[PDB]
Amino acid sequence: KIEEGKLVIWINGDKGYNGLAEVGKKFEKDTGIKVTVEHPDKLEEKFPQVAATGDGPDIIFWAHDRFGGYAQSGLLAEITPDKAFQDKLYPFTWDAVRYNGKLIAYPIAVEALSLIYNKDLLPNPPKTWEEIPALDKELKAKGKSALMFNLQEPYFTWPLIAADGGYAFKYENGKYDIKDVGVDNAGAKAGLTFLVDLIKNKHMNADTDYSIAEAAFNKGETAMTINGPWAWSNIDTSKVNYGVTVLPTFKGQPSKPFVGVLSAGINAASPNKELAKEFLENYLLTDEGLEAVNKDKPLGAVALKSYEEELAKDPRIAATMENAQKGEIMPNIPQMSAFWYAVRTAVINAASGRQTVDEALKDAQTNAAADKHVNYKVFIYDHIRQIAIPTTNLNSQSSLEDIIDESTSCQSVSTDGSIEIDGLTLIHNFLSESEESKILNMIDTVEWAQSQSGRRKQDYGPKVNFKHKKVKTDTFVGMPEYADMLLNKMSEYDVKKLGNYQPFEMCNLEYEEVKKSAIEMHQDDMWIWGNRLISINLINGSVMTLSNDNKSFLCYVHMPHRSLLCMADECRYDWKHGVLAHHIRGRRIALTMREAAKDFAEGGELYEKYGAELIRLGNIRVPL
Ligand SMILES: OC[C@H]1O[C@H](O[C@H]2[C@H](O)[C@@H](O)[C@@H](O[C@H]3[C@H](O)[C@@H](O)[C@@H](O[C@H]4[C@H](O)[C@@H](O)[C@@H](O)O[C@@H]4CO)O[C@@H]3CO)O[C@@H]2CO)[C@H](O)[C@@H](O)[C@@H]1O
Ligand SMILES: O=C(O)CNC(=O)C(=O)O
Ligand SMILES: [Mg+2]
């Protein structure tokens, strides 16, 4: 679980986490309680997975739109400010962190996108999006460009998409109606069409992301960007003569940015809820606390009335709230993340030209009512040609029967649009029936242990605290007797791919269809386990589901009974794998192996502390 007596805090990497850690020091200096501020990548996706097992940070910072999904599953403690503390923050900020009539987080700051422009290049910024193409031709002739901003996150393109009519969910009768989505109406297509036309006409590049746009603006190479308050600190230190103003209109109408309230939720599994309440209320949500965070990266219009008064004069804040007035505060309902996931894909796919605007927004409309796999392009693995074949017969919910059908049908299909997955290897009939019987009779002489998600396990190897990087070898007395016959047979079949394999862990995983056993999508640890992950299908076959978030690809790999799978290189480091429960039939044992990581092998950094000991134990054999 979560350690008592200290506070662990998650906040995104674009916010002032170093200022927040300074508030944590003042907390530690006063209370002796250590505060540790972390900025994990994808923290907003990790928090629901680790909080639901009783783990994670005591306090999570994000915009409020994420928090209704968390609260729905019970991952956020109700917060209990007294009336005097409630009166210290603007009421509208409290309403952004209300879910089913309960306060679920503290509001910190109000954020909205603005147009940021270089006054020395562009003293009169455009009032309209429509005049940017001609603005770019003028500036292109002078070695500059008009406008660069993050095209990879729909947050930055949403103001333009909403402007002429796009919306997430209609607000009607005091509620958000999830049955009425507006991402494929005329207004949304008009705005995304304009964005895609800007890219077709080379006024923007569909690959531009947050860091590329920020550097270009901050080096003085583009006349405009679009960003929020957290970005101003980096502009300041580059001494570009910038201003902050209203976003341009589109088709005569204002751009409508989704307004975020940066918010602090308290993990429901936390045993430190009183310490978190003390920190947030009397250390962070003070003039001195907010100033420390603001001096690192600006927060926007803070929720605390006293410190906002001291900030009202700032013209950048005034422009932020002018844009906020033209947009809307985001919903916080659970479906907001499905909305964003869907719109993220439409924008990427239309901008790249892979899909037209109409079909990209038609797909996002459908998926905004949904599991981010629904948005990915689906492939089936052709084990003969050893490529993944794009298929529209399969989706993220396809049955085992449909996947098995497709994995033979796909072999007579054109290779167009196919991909290779480097380091995916499938060996169809690795074990004979009698070798499998031999191993299975040995395995069922050994005790099974209860594990996660309806699996049982036999574990041969060290106890590993992955989070603390600590290893115990008390339980590690060797590898199972059948390890040699497997390792030799791996070397005989394909020495280049499966040889020189020193098993650091062998682990049998038992699935039963009656128990709904499964294993969630994951990447296996890369601190102690090395490149090649081996899995051998005993008793029954199944499907390894592979996903690539970076590319939005979903690939089904049918693993027939007695096949060997090896996931290495790209397949191991760029993709996730898992076994969905509805792809298990009867009983299956996955006979898995990990090899040593490089830090643990004969020339690594932890070879002396752990690696040499693990090699000795892994060389001895347990008789059956
Ligand atoms: O692999 C796809 C991507 O999935 C992950 O990003 C998701 C998030 O998990 C979703 O929550 C959502 O993100 C929203 C976000 O909730 C919303 O607040 C706003 O984010 C702003 C933020 O308010 C602002 O303070 C500042 O930090 O910039 C953010 C925008 O970058 O808008 C987001 C949508 O753009 O949707 C995305 C998917 O788009 C994962 O984190 C990604 O690494 C991953 O690539
Ligand atoms: O094969 C299975 O059932 C699940 N296996 C893995 O996640 C793996 O081999 O790393
Ligand atoms: Mg795995």
Side-chain angles (χ1 to χ4, degrees), residues 1-21 23-287 289-321 323-370 372-446 448-624:
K1 243 251 243 329
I2 297 157
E3 263 174 59
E4 198 171 11
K6 75 196 229 147
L7 287 168
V8 173
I9 302 187
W10 287 4
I11 184 177
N12 198 41
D14 57 7
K15 308 289 150 53
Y17 55 79
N18 286 320
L20 185 58
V23 182
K25 302 294 164 153
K26 205 269 145 163
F27 194 70
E28 177 171 10
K29 185 196 157 309
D30 279 21
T31 85
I33 301 305
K34 196 177 153 227
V35 175
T36 300
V37 182
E38 307 182 324
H39 47 110
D41 304 316
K42 292 155 145 48
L43 79 91
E44 82 296 345
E45 288 182 342
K46 270 126 91 145
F47 173 79
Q49 337 165 307
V50 294
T53 80
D55 213 19
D58 301 293
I59 300 159
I60 171 163
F61 283 74
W62 201 257
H64 70 287
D65 63 303
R66 260 288 177 172
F67 280 19
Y70 301 161
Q72 186 191 49
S73 325
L75 314 174
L76 295 170
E78 187 202 337
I79 54 165
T80 64
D82 63 38
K83 205 76 36 205
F85 181 81
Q86 269 189 58
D87 283 323
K88 288 174 118 122
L89 315 195
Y90 298 107
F92 80 89
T93 64
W94 284 118
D95 291 347
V97 286
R98 267 191 222 286
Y99 183 76
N100 281 160
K102 253 64 162 93
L103 291 171
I104 67 182
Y106 291 80
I108 314 293
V110 181
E111 317 170 348
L113 288 177
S114 294
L115 184 70
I116 306 178
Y117 70 110
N118 186 330
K119 288 172 179 168
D120 286 319
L121 316 193
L122 188 65
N124 322 294
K127 275 143 174 324
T128 77
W129 279 92
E130 283 87 349
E131 69 204 86
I132 281 165
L135 188 48
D136 189 64
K137 319 151 189 166
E138 211 175 348
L139 276 156
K140 282 286 168 50
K142 311 149 103 163
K144 312 295 182 152
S145 66
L147 164 78
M148 292 189 65
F149 66 100
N150 187 3
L151 296 197
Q152 308 311 300
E153 283 289 344
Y155 179 72
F156 299 80
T157 55
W158 190 253
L160 171 60
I161 291 167
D164 186 56
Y167 58 91
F169 312 95
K170 193 101 216 159
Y171 190 86
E172 198 177 65
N173 312 331
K175 289 96 172 212
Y176 283 106
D177 203 322
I178 50 183
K179 300 157 145 225
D180 184 354
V181 171
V183 331
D184 74 351
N185 67 25
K189 301 165 37 223
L192 187 47
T193 288
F194 190 85
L195 180 80
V196 167
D197 285 349
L198 288 171
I199 290 152
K200 287 181 172 180
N201 298 326
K202 287 162 205 204
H203 307 299
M204 273 185 326
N205 190 316
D207 298 331
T208 303
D209 69 354
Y210 190 97
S211 50
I212 285 152
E214 173 175 50
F217 186 85
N218 288 5
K219 289 174 177 351
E221 312 170 348
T222 192
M224 285 157 326
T225 185
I226 289 166
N227 224 316
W230 52 86
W232 303 334
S233 265
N234 285 351
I235 316 188
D236 286 346
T237 71
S238 78
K239 335 272 156 206
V240 153
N241 191 12
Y242 72 102
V244 189
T245 189
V246 76
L247 287 162
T249 70
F250 175 66
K251 286 171 84 181
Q253 308 156 82
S255 295
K256 297 148 185 57
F258 255 146
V259 181
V261 178
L262 181 69
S263 297
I266 289 145
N267 197 330
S270 162
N272 306 299
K273 293 191 239 239
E274 274 303 319
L275 290 180
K277 180 177 159 174
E278 207 39 37
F279 176 81
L280 293 172
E281 279 176 35
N282 305 120
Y283 288 77
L284 174 57
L285 282 171
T286 63
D287 289 344
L290 289 175
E291 193 163 62
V293 176
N294 200 67
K295 281 168 161 163
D296 179 4
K297 307 288 188 87
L299 285 167
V302 299
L304 179 70
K305 303 170 174 169
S306 60
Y307 192 65
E308 242 314 286
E309 193 92 328
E310 293 184 321
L311 285 198
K313 302 308 180 63
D314 188 334
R316 304 170 308 177
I317 303 309
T320 297
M321 298 303 302
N323 281 305
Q325 201 187 282
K326 286 165 181 328
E328 319 182 2
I329 36 66
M330 291 194 281
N332 70 1
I333 64 181
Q335 289 77 19
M336 274 301 293
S337 67
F339 157 81
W340 286 123
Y341 284 132
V343 177
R344 182 200 162 261
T345 297
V347 171
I348 280 167
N349 283 348
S352 69
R354 291 192 276 288
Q355 290 190 285
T356 72
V357 153
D358 283 45
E359 56 199 350
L361 284 175
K362 169 205 205 179
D363 282 357
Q365 169 91 7
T366 293
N367 290 329
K372 57 201 234 152
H373 279 18
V374 295
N375 293 291
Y376 290 15
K377 188 168 194 202
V378 179
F379 301 79
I380 180 79
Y381 183 63
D382 182 340
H383 77 282
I384 292 302
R385 287 180 290 178
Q386 304 192 21
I387 58 197
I389 288 154
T391 177
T392 48
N393 299 318
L394 296 178
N395 62 60
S396 60
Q397 277 317 298
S398 270
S399 72
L400 173 68
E401 288 72 31
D402 287 1
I403 287 162
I404 295 177
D405 276 331
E406 192 81 358
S407 78
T408 94
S409 282
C410 72
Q411 282 151 29
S412 60
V413 162
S414 157
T415 61
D416 305 332
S418 54
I419 63 178
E420 288 173 314
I421 308 205
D422 181 45
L424 174 55
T425 308
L426 187 62
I427 297 182
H428 223 56
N429 270 300
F430 179 71
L431 298 183
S432 70
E433 279 138 293
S434 54
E435 296 167 326
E436 187 198 28
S437 322
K438 200 169 197 165
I439 294 176
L440 279 173
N441 294 339
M442 280 178 265
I443 278 177
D444 284 321
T445 73
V446 166
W448 289 94
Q450 297 278 113
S451 171
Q452 276 59 62
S453 298
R455 312 182 300 268
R456 293 194 303 162
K457 84 172 322 204
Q458 302 173 347
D459 192 303
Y460 296 84
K463 287 220 213 282
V464 190
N465 190 336
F466 288 110
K467 171 60 206 149
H468 286 57
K469 295 174 235 173
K470 267 207 289 193
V471 183
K472 306 168 221 42
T473 60
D474 262 315
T475 62
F476 191 176
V477 295
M479 282 320 173
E481 186 201 332
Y482 48 76
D484 277 350
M485 168 273 255
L486 297 173
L487 288 156
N488 296 339
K489 199 169 215 252
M490 280 155 63
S491 209
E492 282 160 39
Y493 277 21
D494 193 354
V495 74
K496 253 38 173 196
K497 288 238 145 213
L498 313 173
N500 194 31
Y501 194 106
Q502 175 66 69
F504 249 30
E505 183 193 40
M506 305 197 34
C507 261
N508 296 327
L509 307 168
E510 184 207 63
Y511 301 73
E512 284 277 13
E513 180 186 359
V514 60
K515 289 168 55 171
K516 314 299 200 221
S517 320
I519 188 165
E520 64 308 311
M521 313 280 329
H522 68 273
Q523 281 180 303
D524 273 87
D525 176 90
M526 313 171 195
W527 174 63
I528 181 154
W529 317 138
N531 190 19
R532 302 170 283 174
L533 314 162
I534 272 61
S535 189
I536 308 173
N537 293 268
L538 305 193
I539 312 182
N540 275 288
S542 196
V543 172
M544 198 64 92
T545 293
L546 312 182
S547 72
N548 193 313
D549 294 339
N550 209 258
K551 301 179 162 159
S552 313
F553 292 169
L554 198 267
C555 184
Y556 293 118
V557 172
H558 177 221
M559 306 180 284
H561 178 214
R562 314 194 264 100
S563 67
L564 181 148
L565 182 68
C566 173
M567 307 175 278
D569 316 307
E570 179 197 341
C571 198
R572 155 96 165 102
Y573 297 107
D574 298 348
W575 296 71
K576 297 165 124 146
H577 60 272
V579 187
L580 319 181
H582 62 313
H583 295 158
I584 294 296
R585 294 284 180 272
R587 191 179 184 217
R588 161 174 183 275
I589 295 164
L591 193 169
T592 66
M593 330 178 36
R594 327 280 83 158
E595 68 187 325
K598 67 128 189 184
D599 269 6
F600 291 74
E602 295 180 352
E605 168 230 354
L606 312 150
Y607 175 68
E608 178 195 342
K609 168 68 155 337
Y610 290 140
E613 177 76 40
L614 297 172
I615 292 151
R616 305 192 255 279
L617 300 172
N619 286 340
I620 64 201
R621 294 299 184 255
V622 171
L624 305 156

